[PDB]
Design a protein around this ligand. Structure first.
Ligand SMILES: CCCCCCCCCCCCCC(=O)O
Length: 170
């Protein structure tokens, strides 16, 4: 029996020589590229968004990362966000304090310079695609849509990225 798998994708792992290269390898800037979810409503929050730039930094205490983002809305306005992720020994999963109920799984990406998140939470799930480049190859994005659709997240949103990034700070 055959023809019943989704394209190859793997969860990031802290295993193997170079395992403790997580998280330092992923620090720095990222751009939001696309989302996919079981329903359009799980992506609705992104509909007035033109682009988002993020900066991930080492935290102010041991197992913690500082995330900063500025959202360019389609109306030109810039909205800054900030939060803290918590890391756990031997895992690449992210947890944020609101709430203990949600987790974020990290997956490797066919996009060079890309990463995919799988966000799980109360009554919802969505897949989120980021890249170091604000303009990764269209093929990367097609592959993310094809993968997420195979995983039954068929509602898809591509961020337009027509306008300049808002300023962030590193
Ligand atoms: C150390 C892991 C680095 C992963 C890089 C992705 C950086 C951007 C994360 C954005 C989080 C999504 C926030 C949201 O759901 O609104």
């Amino acid at each position: 029996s055959h023809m019943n798998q989704c394209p190859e994708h793997s969860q990031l792992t802290t295993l193997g020589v170079d395992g403790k290269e997580f998280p330092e390898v992923h620090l720095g800037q990222w751009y939001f590229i696309a989302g996919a979810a079981p329903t359009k409503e799980e992506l609705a929050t992104f509909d007035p968004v033109d682009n988002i730039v993020f900066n991930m930094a080492a935290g102010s205490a041991p197992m913690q990362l500082h995330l900063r983002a500025t959202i360019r809305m389609k109306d030109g306005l810039c909205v800054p966000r900030k939060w803290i992720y918590h890391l756990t020994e031997g895992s690449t999963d992210l947890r944020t304090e609101g709430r203990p109920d949600m987790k974020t799984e990290l997956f490797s990406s066919s996009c060079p310079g890309g990463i995919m998140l799988n966000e799980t939470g109360q009554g919802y799930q969505r897949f989120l695609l980021y890249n170091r480049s604000p303009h990764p190859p269209e093929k990367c994005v097609e592959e993310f849509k094809s993968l997420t659709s195979c995983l039954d997240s068929k509602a898809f949103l591509l961020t337009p990225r027509n306008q300049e990034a808002c300023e962030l700070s590193n």
